């Protein structure tokens, strides 16, 4: 298969600091974008997306334009307390109405300790 592993179930990060959510693709196929969400279900919010917009408070950890890229790790900056939540790295596949959810990483609970 292609497997989406998020190896950290938690990350404990200081308020105002940068948080890295690790996510790695074991293989490149099927072709299609990566997408970071907060929560599961319909009210999951879209936190990053390869193919869409710019996201002001999200750099990406690796250069995505490079060819055999399999790291999809994100850096949310200026983490505020209400950035706590569960984040899910999700592979979508190619479609026609297009880009259907293929596989989700098992999740990375974020938590902000207000600390100097």
């Amino acid at each position: 298969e292609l497997q989406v592993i998020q190896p950290d179930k938690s990350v404990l990060v200081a308020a105002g600091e940068t948080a890295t959510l690790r996510c790695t693709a074991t293989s490149l196929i099927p072709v299609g974008p990566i997408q970071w969400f907060r929560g599961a279900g319909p009210g999951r919010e879209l936190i990053y997306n390869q193919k869409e917009g710019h996201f002001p408070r999200v750099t990406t950890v690796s250069d995505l334009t490079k060819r055999n890229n399999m790291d999809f790790s994100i850096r949310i900056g200026a983490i505020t307390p209400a950035d706590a939540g569960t984040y899910y790295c999700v592979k979508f596949r190619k479609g026609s109405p297009d880009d259907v959810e293929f596989k989700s990483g098992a999740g990375t609970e974020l938590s902000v300790r207000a600390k100097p």
Partner: antibody
Amino acid sequence: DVQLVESGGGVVRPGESLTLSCTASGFTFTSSTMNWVRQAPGEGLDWVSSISTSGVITYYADSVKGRATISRDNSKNTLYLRLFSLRADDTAIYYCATDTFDHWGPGTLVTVSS
Amino acid sequence: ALTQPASVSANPGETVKITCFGSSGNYGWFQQKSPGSAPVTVIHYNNKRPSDIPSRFSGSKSGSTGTLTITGVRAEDEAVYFCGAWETGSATFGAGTTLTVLG
């Protein structure tokens, strides 16, 4: 354990407004999405609305878009649903459900009637 | 949009599959013993079984289709089963698959 307790159920007069509550325990409400689904007695489940962790994104079903507000209050682990200009159509048992519909409230029967 | 079988009949001890399509999203299967009584999730997010629910219940997504598999159906699995699917931004349910055990 997870426990969901709806309330607000009863009769409301057609064309008027009413709010459902749902209290949640046994899980991390803040870090969790929420939905409302309803079921006209002896008919099918119908999605009504969803809400994000934060509360800033709300989604709604054509059922009720415009004339419902879904809301949450994480400070007291409670989820809401004001419903406006109530119709015979809307008479239903209304269930809150977590996240990916993994746990369900016992439901609260709302009857639109004069 | 979701179509699912209006009813399927099965003999005890046998392996029934109900399937559901109409969505590109993730699928859940919700049990309902009787009209009125609350739904109980037998599978969510395609293939996750709650700790509670017994192991004869298994879920799969392939293509844009969901399949609930009861392996060794029992008298107490006799119920109504609704598939539902969600994407980011929306959810939907099927019209319900009433299952009865022969015998």
